[PDB]
Structure formats: structure tokens, C-alpha cells
């Protein structure tokens, strides 16, 4: 091998390139070709005892490498689970790769993971997706519940946009011993296929990687048959544990090696092409991730030049960073500039209407937040002949907190049209929009809107928070009047009692857009984990709308506010 040689880290964008091009041709020759090349048994799996114990008939555990539980006294089949140990890079047993739990197995599932002295559960999977069952539910709703011999407590949960993490206490009955175990819940995997891009699950993995001990047993990774995300998981997270000493890659080498642990192991060649470019990503990013007691240090790093160089940190951080809808003809004029369009699958689609086409179409895009997802609408500013549009997509979407990032003119020109009445009602198409109030505070307005549908006499009230003292070259000097700005939209979300996302423009949508975005959720996060990565918040921004935070300056304008928010 020969044949398959390890990828030098600088040879491993050309190498991906290579398999992907003519649709993934070598890509889809190389993945058939993958053979361990010996014979395994599976006799346990297949016991009449043990076939219910398995939640795929056609996924079974090979007995050379199954996870082998105590027996319990006069129950046949008891030293049973669905389950294998597979390697990492140089780290053998790393991992116990299983199926998503059965009702039948919760048991046997938490007392592997006592006896097999595990800290530590990676659940690659939504417990239902597309109103199919993945897994089913092991852990308790709140508080404890004995599953076998096992009392697990849940101490607490932490749920956020793409993941959730959940912390549990282990105490086996009879047992001095009490053994803290948490669980990682990757939530971002998509229905069908596999992640469009790569950045929600390497902040997922970055996460597991930061809260697993030391001193303890395999780390137990599951997803439904506990193979295909399973695989994905622990070869991309073997190959970035190999390139920290290494600098190579070989993931035909480790999904071979895979192969003769568990059955099926990187499951489809979408699966092995995803694998790839979260490696090619993974190695382009660097690690830019401070704690709150860092973060002035590492401002302090990034505002110097190096020797040798002839630019700030800060702006090598930023360069780094580095579709069909929008593109149609009949949707040309809607777009501000032509250079700024949505992606498709994370774009605004409007209700169609009946006799229009393209009336699906605004240049607007579903950005997730700390949180939750879709948190936030970006879109440009309205144009003249987007503004109906522009008031449709709020309804038909839930939205009823627009933020405004621009004058509607700045430097003598036209940044945004008024798409908003004043001096008495208007109707745009379906809405009919009257003005209730308006309130001028030193860095912002607010301006409140009653909102009727024509159609059915439903109401709602929006309001639209412009913020008026952003500079109209550079950025604000300080980030005091921003960040309470920030924090008055968020209070009003909450007061509220919002639902939808805010949605948020400036002139194109992805500038002054990219920062407010940036900061609501960098801000928040700081606060509860006291942790800042202000670069990859805007890696994953860019995978759901080009060009978010569009300069340097407006980059280092989100660590300054973020070192000025630890300040107060």
C-alpha cells in the first residue's frame, strides 16, 4: 500500500480534489476497493437471545472484537451487547462503537459503560429524524432512573443549536463507587445524505475532545446502527489525532483497519467523501479558542506583526476565513448586488404565488444562533421592488423584530429604500402596516408596527430597531453603544415573548450583519461558558450565507467588543 499510500497534510486538497472530480469516480473506485481480508465470526449476535438485543438484524458485533458485559447469574445471553471496540490513531480499544439503545438494552447499554469504565458518550444522531426512530431514549427525563443494576442521575443539561451535552452521575446498587459520565448529542446531521459542510460537526468534536478525562475507559460512540456516522466520527477524529505528531493522513488505511473491528464501518461513500472535507477544513483552521482570563493576551498577540511578516495576527486570522434560486433571471433585479446571493439551502423560500414564479424568491438567508437554530434572518437592505417581499417574509416566517444596520443614506448615497410608512398607513401587496410609535434614543430607533393580513384580518405587532451610529467609514470606536443595542433586541425578544427569528440587514446583509450576528451569539456564549472563538463563529456564519463580516476591521471590531463586554 502501495496504492494507497498516507496523504501529506499539504498534498490532501489536491488528493480530495482528485477523487471528487468526474463525480466522485476515484473517490467511489478507491471506497469499493476497501477489504480487511479475513473472516470474522458473529456467533453471539445471532443466539436466539440475543437477535432482539440487536436493533438492525444486518448489523451485528463480530465476536473477536465484541464488548463483552458480566454475566448475570442463570440469565443466558447476558454477556451480550451490540458492540465493538475499534482503534483511534496509535490508541488501541479508543472507542466502543454501538447501536442506538432498544428499550430491551438500556440496561445492558449503562452497565457497559460501567464496567467498561467509560467517562465519556458520543450520540451521533437525532433520537428521531424525518418521523423515523434512530434511538430511543436511555437516559432519564430528569433526575434518576435504574436501568438494570445502574442508577443514572441526570445533573444537567446544556442544549444548544447544533448539540446538546448532558452530564450524568453512575451508581451500580451495592456499589461505595459514583462515576460521572457525559454525553455529547450531535444534532446537526441532516435528514438525508451527509453535512453540507463540515463546520458544525468539528465544533461538535472540538467540544468532546476538551470534556473527556484522562484516566478513562473507550469512549462509547453511537448513532442508529452505530456504523456509518459512528465511522465518520472516530476516523476524522483519529486522523486529527494523527497529524498533531504526524502531519499525514490515512483514512483508507484506518477505515481498512475499521473494517475488521466492526461490521459496515464508514457506511456510504457520501459518508467517506464527508470524511475528507472536515480533515481538508480541519487542517486549514488552527485553533482559535481562548478562555475569558486569555482573551486580552490573545487581542494583544493578534494586534502585533510578526517578525518575518507584514501584516497583524489579526489579519491573517481574518484571511483565513477564505446558487441556482438567486441566480435565475427572473429573480436578477431582487438582489441588491450580484456578487451577494443566498445560498439555496439555507435561503428564505416565500409561499409561491399561484400565477408570479420566482415569487418564492427573497435574497434573505436562515442563520442559527447560540442556541437554536434558524435564530436570525439575514437579508439585504429592501429595495423599492423587494419591499412587499420583504414584508411577506416576515409574516409567513414568524419574524417580528427587524434589526436595521445602516442609514437609509450614508456617504451621499442610497443605502437602503424605506420600506417602512410614517406618516400613515400603507399597504404592501397582503399588509396592510401602521405606524404606532417611534422612539429616537442616542445610538438607535425604534419603531413599532401594527401588521394586518388583508386577507384574513389577522394582527401582529413588529418592531424594527435601526441603529444609527455606526460610522459610515470604519468601525464604531467603541463597542459600548453596540452592545447594549445587542442586548435591547435580545430583551425585547425575550419580554415578548418571541418565537420566529429577528431578522437582521444592513445593505447587502452580510457586513454590519455578519457582526451583529457574530457578537449576540460570541457574547452569550462567553457568559455561560466563558470561552471566545470569534473565528470560527464567522467559519460557520459562512456556511450559511456568503461574505458574513466582510472586512478586517470589522472583525477586529468583534474582539474588541467582546474584550469590552468581559471589561464591565
Not at 437554530?373 to 427587524?402: C, H
Not at 430607533?445 to 401582529?460: H, N, P, Y
Request: proline letters at 5%.
Amino acid at each position: 500500500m502501495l496504492s494507497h499510500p498516507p496523504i501529506p497534510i499539504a498534498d490532501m486538497a489536491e488528493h480530495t480534489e482528485r477523487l471528487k472530480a468526474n463525480d466522485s469516480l476515484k473517490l467511489s473506485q478507491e471506497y469499493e476497493s476497501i477489504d480487511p481480508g479475513q473472516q470474522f465470526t458473529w456467533e453471539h449476535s445471532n443466539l436466539e437471545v440475543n437477535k432482539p438485543k440487536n436493533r438492525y438484524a444486518n448489523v451485528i458485533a463480530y465476536d473477536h472484537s465484541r464488548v463483552i458485559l458480566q454475566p448475570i447469574e442463570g440469565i443466558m445471553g447476558s454477556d451480550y451487547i451490540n458492540a465493538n471496540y475499534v482503534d483511534g490513531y496509535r490508541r488501541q480499544n479508543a472507542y466502543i462503537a454501538t447501536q442506538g439503545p432498544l428499550p430491551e438494552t438500556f440496561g445492558d447499554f449503562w452497565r457497559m459503560v460501567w464496567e467498561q469504565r467509560s467517562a465519556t458518550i458520543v450520540m451521533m444522531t437525532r433520537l428521531e429524524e424525518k418521523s423515523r426512530i434512530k434511538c430511543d431514549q436511555y437516559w432519564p427525563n430528569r433526575g434518576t432512573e435504574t436501568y438494570g443494576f445502574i442508577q443514572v442521575t441526570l445533573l444537567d443539561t446544556i442544549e444548544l443549536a447544533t448539540f446538546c451535552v448532558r452530564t450524568f452521575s453512575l451508581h451500580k446498587n451495592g456499589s461505595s463507587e459514583k462515576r460521572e459520565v457525559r454525553q455529547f448529542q450531535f444534532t446537526a446531521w441532516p435528514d438525508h445524505g451527509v453535512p453540507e459542510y463540515p463546520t458544525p460537526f468539528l465544533a461538535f468534536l472540538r467540544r468532546v475532545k476538551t470534556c473527556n478525562p484522562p484516566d478513562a475507559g473507550p469512549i462509547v460512540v453511537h448513532c442508529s446502527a452505530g456504523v456509518g456516522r459512528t465511522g465518520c466520527f472516530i476516523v476524522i477524529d483519529a486522523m486529527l489525532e494523527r497529524i498533531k505528531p504526524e502531519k499525514t493522513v490515512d483514512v483508507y488505511g484506518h477505515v481498512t483497519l475499521m473494517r475488521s473491528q466492526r461490521n459496515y464501518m464508514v457506511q456510504t461513500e457520501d459518508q467517506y467523501s464527508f470524511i475528507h472535507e472536515a480533515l481538508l477544513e480541519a487542517v486549514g483552521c488552527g485553533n482559535t479558542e481562548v478562555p475569558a482570563r486569555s482573551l486580552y493576551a490573545y487581542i494583544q498577540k493578534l494586534a502585533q506583526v510578526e517578525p518575518g511578516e507584514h501584516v497583524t495576527g489579526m489579519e491573517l486570522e481574518f484571511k483565513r476565513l477564505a446558487f441556482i434560486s438567486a441566480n435565475l433571471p427572473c429573480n436578477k433585479f431582487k438582489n441588491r448586488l450580484v456578487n451577494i446571493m443566498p445560498y439555496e439551502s439555507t435561503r428564505v423560500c416565500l409561499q409561491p404565488i399561484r400565477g408570479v414564479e420566482g415569487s418564492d424568491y427573497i435574497n434573505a438567508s436562515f442563520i442559527d444562533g447560540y442556541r437554536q437554530q434558524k435564530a436570525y434572518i439575514a437579508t439585504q437592505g429592501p429595495l423599492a421592488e423587494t419591499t412587499e417581499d420583504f414584508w411577506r417574509m416576515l409574516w409567513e416566517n414568524n419574524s417580528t423584530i427587524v434589526v436595521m444596520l445602516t442609514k437609509l443614506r450614508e456617504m451621499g448615497r442610497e443605502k437602503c429604500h424605506q420600506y417602512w410608512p410614517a406618516e400613515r398607513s400603507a399597504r404592501y401587496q397582503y399588509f396592510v402596516v401602521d405606524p404606532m410609535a417611534e422612539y429616537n434614543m442616542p445610538q438607535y430607533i425604534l419603531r413599532e408596527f401594527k401588521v394586518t393580513d388583508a386577507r384574513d384580518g389577522q394582527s401582529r405587532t413588529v418592531r424594527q430597531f435601526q441603529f444609527t451610529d455606526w460610522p459610515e467609514q470604519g468601525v464604531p470606536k467603541s463597542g459600548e453603544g453596540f452592545i447594549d443595542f445587542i442586548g435591547q433586541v435580545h430583551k425585547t425578544k425575550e419580554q415578548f415573548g418571541q418565537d420566529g427569528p429577528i431578522s437582521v440587514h444592513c445593505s447587502a446583509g452580510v457586513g454590519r450583519t455578519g457582526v451583529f450576528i457574530t457578537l449576540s451569539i460570541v457574547l452569550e456564549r462567553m457568559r455561560y461558558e466563558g470561552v471566545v472563538d470569534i473565528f470560527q463563529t464567522v467559519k460557520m456564519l459562512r456556511t450559511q450565507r456568503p461574505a458574513m463580516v466582510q472586512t478586517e476591521d470589522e472583525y477586529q471590531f468583534c474582539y474588541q467588543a467582546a474584550l469590552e463586554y468581559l471589561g464591565s
